[PDB]
Scaffold this active site. Structure first.
Site, short mmCIF file in Angstrom:
data_model
loop_
_atom_site.label_atom_id
_atom_site.label_comp_id
_atom_site.label_asym_id
_atom_site.label_seq_id
_atom_site.Cartn_x
_atom_site.Cartn_y
_atom_site.Cartn_z
N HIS A 78 -48.77 16.25 35.86
CA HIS A 78 -48.77 15.08 36.72
C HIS A 78 -49.70 13.97 36.26
CE1 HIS A 78 -46.95 17.57 40.26
NE2 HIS A 78 -46.31 17.66 39.13
N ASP A 79 -50.47 14.24 35.19
CA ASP A 79 -51.25 13.20 34.51
C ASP A 79 -50.35 12.57 33.45
OD1 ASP A 79 -54.72 13.38 33.17
OD2 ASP A 79 -53.39 11.66 33.32
CA CA Z 1 -51.98 9.82 32.35
#
Ligand code: CA
Ligand SMILES: *[C@@H]1O[C@H](CO[C@@H]2O[C@@H](C)[C@@H](O)[C@@H](O)[C@@H]2O)[C@@H](O[C@@H]2O[C@H](CO)[C@@H](O[C@@H]3O[C@H](CO[C@H]4O[C@H](CO)[C@@H](O)[C@H](O)[C@@H]4O)[C@@H](O)[C@H](O[C@H]4O[C@H](CO)[C@@H](O)[C@H](O)[C@@H]4O)[C@@H]3O)[C@H](O)[C@H]2NC(C)=O)[C@H](O)[C@H]1NC(C)=O
Ligand SMILES: *[C@@H]1O[C@H](CO[C@@H]2O[C@@H](C)[C@@H](O)[C@@H](O)[C@@H]2O)[C@@H](O[C@@H]2O[C@H](CO)[C@@H](O[C@@H]3O[C@H](CO[C@H]4O[C@H](CO)[C@@H](O)[C@H](O)[C@@H]4O)[C@@H](O)[C@H](O[C@H]4O[C@H](CO)[C@@H](O)[C@H](O)[C@@H]4O)[C@@H]3O)[C@H](O)[C@H]2NC(C)=O)[C@H](O)[C@H]1NC(C)=O
Ligand code: HEM
Ligand code: HEM
Ligand code: NAG
Ligand code: NAG
Ligand code: NAG
Ligand code: NAG
Ligand code: CA
Lengths: 466, 104, 466, 104
Positions: free
Chosen positions: D95-96
């Protein structure tokens, strides 16, 4: 904004500005016309702008047959079952076929001589009329197709027009591939780069991407450095054919009337065979016929082709010289002294640094044509890498490459290995004496010339269906 | 794409069966490196007055041509080992490979 | 319309068709809901369809800070100059901050417990509420940011809100990179693939493309095979926290109310530390909690995550198994026998051929998770290649990589080398006993656990502006 | 892009100075191989009834899940060498890196 009549910089125009003390254009409010290439995804704020290739990337003679179905249909003679390409209905070249005329709304060819009223020719590609020498090559290939379709009909009576067209198109496509990889590319790349980028063909690899790379569209423009300032025309004894044996290139662009009314394609093909190409040297890069007077007769101002090349690479978002050197696994000079060593020319390196500030910003065509030519080649390391890399992909990633198993029989391949550009000229013109192979090296008459009778024609016997 | 065929299509479609538009007409060029535009995604270098490229002013294309390409035609060196046909086949072949459309 | 409430296959839907005799979805004309990923160039007949990454590809804690300016600004506490991230104004977890609530139009979290009325959380990434264990990690890093900004403020009284925010953000991003590359990736790839794909860092290379590859979005889903069918919650002494110590995963998706009303993030973090991950085995690939009942409480029927991954790879136009094996330089099995050798499991190879017919068509996720796991790794050769290749690009192509010269000072780098996830947990929770490093390997209480008091805090002395 | 900069932008813009959108948000993914669509450019395999993929029927994703992925839950094997925190960091990290938007 009209990019042809205005110097306002607004979409889709990107006019080239004029520097102080320009040798030709003294008015700095003027400009060299330039239309940005069409974007693949118009008006997007998500995609990184890319350009479009309107042609098939494969070496399949699409400049003869067309790359879209409506066009490919219109180029064919549908009045019968002979599988022929349509010929000019108004004119012939000493009894031989000319290309049909096109119907352009703003025909540039008509502007090259108002009185003659000869429009541009219709071909598989839209640029066939750009110079009479190119037109002569398109015309030569159109004739060879019809000649092959005719011989194929003799050998195979049950073949309909479609079968004849496709078998002739298939042979012509193989001929363009053979002339390009066997004769042309080795002389572009030189032996070392030829072996590195084009190792012996094995077979079709469906994981090899055959698309034209955006950089190739600019890098392959290296050929602009081979352009001579004249169109040379010679008679049957290879002597200057009067009245004008040496027409300035700025008076031959789109000059289709010269093919129709000034002797057809034979004088032009003989001039191409018996005249040297221009050599690319570091202080003799490209001639003023294309640098000062490109398309002078067909628009408001003469264009600069070398300048357009550099504006186009910027239009296309192409990385600078060092990025391409890195891509190719070549050292990237950072100082004027390092650039001097890479170019084997400190004087040119200094000219480049004065212009760009850093070798990182040198436009790809400028940097590429600036490099010293490889031994027995006509490009340096960078262009050899970009050009050799492209052609290996077009070869290995083509399901219909002529040597791919299943495309041609072993006997058909043996037969096709006998084709040559000199022989095709012999088969489709009034020329009876042509260059010895390799046609791209031979350039001196009579030393490099032989009689057509000594060159065996393509044997289509293994095409018999029986 | 047809399970079997006999010849090339005119558009080049179906040459590569897993990705049938590869090498076909009217498709975006492939890029061998990330594009480099003034604003990162669309504007060409040289578009906006005063915007430098990688730390240096963008040189007018016409200025580079004037200063590096221009040469006196009397110095022209005829290539003793290439014919003018070498140039001509290159243009013809180029026209088999790519044409980049522009608006009229 | 609605891809969630209808099975009509029309834009933008691509509903999953149901096989005959499905053990759950008995009516074969029905389907599993599926929306096609947004195309980068909508409605085009030129571009080859591609998808969009809404996030920054860099390992920069954008799931905390946001990847768009309006959002990043809304995640911040702008009521003062302390450089903090905003925290929930309605609830607290035993005195500690929770993520603020988001304002969604069709809030899925409200459906998980209609009477609790607890909406989804607002974070840098839109999926923070997808399972409470993820929410706990998001909440942990939010607290760490605020703790860092508070310490930096004491250390540097003259630093304003923007400086404090940026300096804390910089440290949090470095922490995510270190935990990821030092502790996590070695245990995913195994030592052999770690050395091949992630050789020692030498320097930022501005010619390394840091973009996420389309295939990675699907290949990194290997982690679905690690998912346990329950959310485990442990109390102060790592014993089951009554009355619901083991909640079925199908009742925790979007269950933000459990974080708010069932004891906060401490029981959840302890459960993650002292419970084993599920092991991926060739006859035990993924659990029915995600295969039969994914999002059961917020959808018309339960979804199937493994099936969604495969439909997604098709939506994204991803090549099949052998093309990715070829891209990675690994042998491409063409027969059931060859596939049996590659997988070291002829039974699974037979199962794959009955479903796909050819290994050329196996979807990337399925073929990738079917491969035997590399030694001391949790992926096979294919997934090791794709994941390893991606993370090297995210490291080498990141100008703000924590080890890049100029980002942090030598002494700041020395300080950051002491950070660890167990310490971050100690600093921002009521947990006083945590896993020993490596936190991703340790999984058994009390064997793999130590007192927080044995772990030195991050030393921020080198952040003092002299 | 500014000449000097102490911190990342929020969007990832300007991390790479020559191509400032690389790694930036709301941009197309890079592709490592040519896309494979039913019509060559947009329709996914499994879209059109009767269209095979490279000589074989498109396997229903739900059929592959049922026949190859499904297993009895009581057979689950706990990983003696990984914590569930190993699973959770993977999702957090994912999710990064990527979020592929869809219409609502
Ligand atoms: Ca990122
Ligand atoms: C900075 O990073 C650059 C990127 O490096 C890649 O990514 C990182 C993360 C690492 O994994 C690294 O190992 C990767 O390479 C890096 O630049 C790259 O450098 C390589 C090596 O010089 C370049 O490869 C050469 O490419 C040319 C051009 O063809 C390539 O592109 C086409 C089109 O996509 C493909 O079809 C080709 O297969 C190639 O991939 C090739 O001509 C050349 O091969 C020929 O020469 C070698 C050597 O003599 C022979 O072994 C071959 O058989 C051929 O005859 C290389 O394959 C690569 O293009 C280039 N990428 C970029 C983006 O520029 C740079 O070196 C790094 N710098 C530092 C200091 O770390
Ligand atoms: C059919 O053609 C395929 C394409 O071949 C290319 O084009 C033709 C015209 C030739 O020029 C040929 O030389 C070109 O390679 C060909 O498949 C290709 O095979 C190579 C070799 O196996 C693959 O390279 C490997 O790639 C992986 C993945 O990384 C690559 O992609 C990323 C993303 O773009 C880049 O950043 C990387 O730099 C790579 O380019 C690499 O992991 C791997 O390197 C690692 O492993 C080797 C071996 O141990 C080590 O030496 C390295 O240090 C690394 O640790 C290779 O670089 C290539 O991806 C693949 N392309 C495709 C499209 O599949 C195929 O083999 C040909 N088949 C036949 C029968 O001829
Ligand atoms: C009679 C000789 C040639 C020309 C006249 C001529 C002209 C051009 C022009 C006007 C362009 C476009 C310039 C722009 O960017 O605005 C151009 C493009 C390309 N050329 Fe040129 N060219 C003549 C001759 C050659 C030769 C000998 C070439 C190669 C050996 C050659 C190549 C190219 C290529 C590849 C392009 C780009 C084509 C595209 O649209 O993709 N040219 N040339
Ligand atoms: C709490 C555990 C996890 C989920 C619940 C979950 C759910 C999904 C869903 C619904 C998708 C999209 C499915 C579709 O294609 O329709 C999804 C995508 C991705 N995941 Fe999943 N995931 C959970 C856990 C993990 C773990 C542990 C992962 C990695 C180790 C992981 C990865 C991914 C990735 C990379 C994607 C794609 C993200 C994108 O939109 O680009 N997931 N997961
Ligand atoms: C078609 O072929 C016939 C026979 O060769 C020829 O007479 C006719 O002119 C051709 N028509 C066109 C349009 O080329
Ligand atoms: C134009 O064409 C005519 C034939 O119609 C020709 O006689 C004349 O020489 C040409 N004009 C020029 C300027 O070459
Ligand atoms: C902002 O910070 C102050 C001080 O910590 C805190 O009291 C306040 O609740 C915060 N506001 C928000 C919206 O987080
Ligand atoms: C819903 O939330 C309430 C607290 O507001 C709780 O008492 C109840 O047990 C929850 N419902 C379920 C099904 O767990
Ligand atoms: Ca072509």
């Amino acid at each position: 904004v009209n990019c042809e009549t205005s110097c306002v910089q607004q979409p889709p125009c990107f006019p080239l500005k004029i520097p102080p003390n320009d040798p030709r254009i003294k008015n700095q409010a003027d400009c060299i016309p330039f239309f940005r290439s069409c974007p693949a995804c118009p008006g997007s704020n998500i995609t990184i702008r890319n350009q479009i290739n309107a042609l098939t990337s494969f070496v399949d003679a699409s400049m003869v047959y067309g790359s879209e179905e409506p066009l490919a249909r219109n180029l064919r003679n549908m009045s019968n079952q002979l599988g022929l390409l349509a010929v000019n209905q108004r004119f012939q070249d000493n009894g031989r076929a000319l290309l049909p005329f096109d119907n352009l709304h703003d025909d540039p060819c008509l502007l090259t001589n108002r009185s003659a009223r000869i429009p541009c020719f219709l071909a598989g590609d839209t640029r066939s009329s750009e110079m009479p020498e190119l037109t002569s090559m398109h015309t030569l290939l159109l004739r060879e197709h019809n000649r092959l379709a005719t011989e194929l009909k003799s050998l195979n009576p049950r073949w309909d027009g479609e079968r004849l067209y496709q078998e002739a198109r298939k042979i012509v496509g193989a001929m363009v591939q053979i002339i390009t990889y066997r004769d042309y590319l080795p002389l572009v790349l030189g032996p070392t780069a030829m072996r590195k980028y084009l190792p012996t063909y094995r077979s079709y690899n469906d994981s090899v991407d055959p698309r034209i790379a955006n950089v190739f569209t600019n890098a392959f423009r290296y050929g602009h450095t081979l352009i001579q300032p004249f169109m040379f025309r010679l008679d049957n004894r290879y002597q200057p054919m009067e009245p004008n044996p040496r027409v300035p290139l700025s008076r031959v662009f789109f000059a289709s009337w010269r093919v129709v009314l000034e002797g057809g394609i034979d004088p032009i093909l003989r001039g191409l065979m018996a005249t040297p190409a221009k050599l690319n040297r570091q202080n003799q890069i490209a001639v003023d016929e294309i640098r000062e007077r490109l398309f002078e007769q067909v628009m408001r101002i003469g264009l600069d082709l070398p300048a357009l090349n550099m504006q186009r690479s910027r239009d296309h978002g192409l990385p600078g010289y060092n990025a391409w050197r890195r891509f190719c696994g070549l050292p990237q000079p950072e100082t004027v002294g390092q650039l001097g060593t890479v170019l084997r020319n400190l004087k040119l390196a200094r000219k480049l640094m004065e212009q760009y500030g850093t070798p990182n910003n040198i436009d790809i065509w400028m940097g590429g044509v600036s490099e010293p030519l490889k031994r027995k080649g006509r490009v340096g390391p960078l262009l050899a890498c970009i050009i050799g890399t492209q052609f290996r992909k077009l070869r290995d990633g083509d399901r219909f490459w002529w040597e791919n198993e299943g495309v041609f029989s072993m006997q058909q391949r043996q037969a096709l290995a006998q084709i040559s550009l000199p022989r095709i000229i012999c088969d489709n013109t009034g020329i009876t004496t042509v260059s010895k192979n390799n046609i791209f090296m031979s350039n001196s008459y009579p030393r490099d010339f032989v009689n057509c009778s000594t060159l065996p024609a393509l044997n289509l016997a293994s095409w018999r269906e029986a | 794409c047809p399970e079997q065929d006999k010849y090339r299509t005119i558009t080049g479609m179906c040459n590569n069966r897993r990705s049938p538009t590869l090498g076909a007409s009217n498709r975006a060029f492939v890029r061998w490196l990330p594009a480099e535009y003034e604003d990162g995604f669309s504007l060409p270098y040289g578009w906006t007055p005063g915007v430098k490229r990688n730390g240096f002013p963008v040189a007018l294309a016409r200025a580079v041509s004037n200063e590096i390409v221009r040469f006196p035609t009397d110095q022209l060196t005829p290539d003793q080992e290439r014919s003018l046909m070498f140039m001509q086949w290159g243009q013809l072949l180029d026209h088999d490979l790519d044409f980049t459309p522009e608006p009229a």
